[PDB]
């Protein structure tokens, strides 16, 4: 074997930054949608008392 490497992600030094940028973009998008979907505001008025 002689302890020889297999070139794990040659020139990683900028592609890992690229993956970071993509991941933070995905995080921003999914966070915004999760916030607006958890806390969607359907009105929920003028008939809610008939069902209570």
């Amino acid at each position: 074997p002689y302890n020889l490497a297999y070139k794990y992600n040659l020139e990683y030094s900028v592609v890992f930054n690229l993956v970071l940028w993509i991941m933070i973009g995905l995080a921003l998008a999914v966070i915004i949608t999760s916030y607006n979907i958890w806390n969607m505001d359907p009105g929920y008025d003028s008939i809610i008392y008939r069902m209570t």
Binding site: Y2, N3, L4, S13, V14, F16, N17
Partner: peptide
């Protein structure tokens, strides 16, 4: 011994050149 030791990575773990701007 004839076996190499596990070679250290010359690239550190990032590119400092754009790490400044980052």
């Amino acid at each position: 011994g004839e076996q190499f030791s596990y070679a250290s990575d010359c690239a550190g773990f990032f590119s400092p050149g754009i790490w400044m701007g980052l």
